[PDB]
Amino acid sequence: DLIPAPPLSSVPLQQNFQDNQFQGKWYVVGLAGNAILREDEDPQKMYATIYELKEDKSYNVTSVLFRDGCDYWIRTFVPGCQPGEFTLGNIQSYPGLTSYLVRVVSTNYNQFAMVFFKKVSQNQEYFKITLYGRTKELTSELQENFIRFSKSLGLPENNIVFPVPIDQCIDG
């Protein structure tokens, strides 16, 4: 009894998405989804994601996280059906991962973004929304819009966290 993924008709797409302006480092300031839980003796720690636009218009996408120590994982997001949407490249290479979808919901490129993800993995549907910031903090107002958007997708307050800013790893 995991919360079902919302229909896609409920997830907006950023109008006139600009791939070149979305490049760069984004810090995950907010995180919400059906497998995310407000854990208090091990609160989630902030991580970063770096997007890099290639000649073929896919992104190299690199996640940097603290764990023992630092992990850097690089993946490929391939432009999907409509601008702002992507699929995961080389999906054959991820075991038990059946599908993966990304949709940029909104962004102003130089301050924040909200991005929606939905995947099917070991035969289960998982989704999440990240609130990306170009810095490690954002306004209260942008946090509230993120919370409201998340609730609009069926998530209660417990499935929404704000990762604590850190210095190890994520900046190198």
Numbering used by the authors: 6 to 72, 74 to 178
Give verbatim lines from the article:
Hence, to identify residues required for megalin binding, we mutated 18 positively charged amino acids on the surface of LCN2, based on information from its crystal structure (K15, 46, 50, 59, 62, 73, 74, 75, 98, 118, 142, 149, 157; H165; and R43, 72, 130, 140). We found 13 LCN2 mutants that could load with Ent:55Fe and then could traffic through the kidney into the urine, particularly K3 (19% of input). To define the structural basis for iron trafficking by K3, we solved its crystal structure. Views of the molecular surfaces of LCN2 (top) and K3 (bottom) coloured according to electrostatic potentials, showed the large effect on the chemical character of LCN2 by the resurfacing mutations. Nonetheless, superposition of native and K3 structures demonstrated a high degree of overall structural conservation, including complete conservation of the ligand-binding site. In other words, neither the fold nor the ligand-binding site of LCN2 were affected by the mutation of surface residues, allowing K3 and K3Cys to efficiently traffic Ent:iron. The addition of native or K3, however completely blocked the Ent- or catechol-mediated conversion of Fe+3 to Fe+2 (P<0.05±LCN2 with either Ent or catechol:iron, Student's t-test; n=3 each) and the subsequent oxidation of HPF to fluorescein (P<10−7, Student's t-test, n=3, across all points). In sum, biochemical, cellular and animal data, suggested the hypothesis that K3 and K3Cys bypassed the proximal tubule as a result of a failure to recognize megalin. Fortunately, K3 maintains almost all structural and functional features of the native protein permitting iron transport.
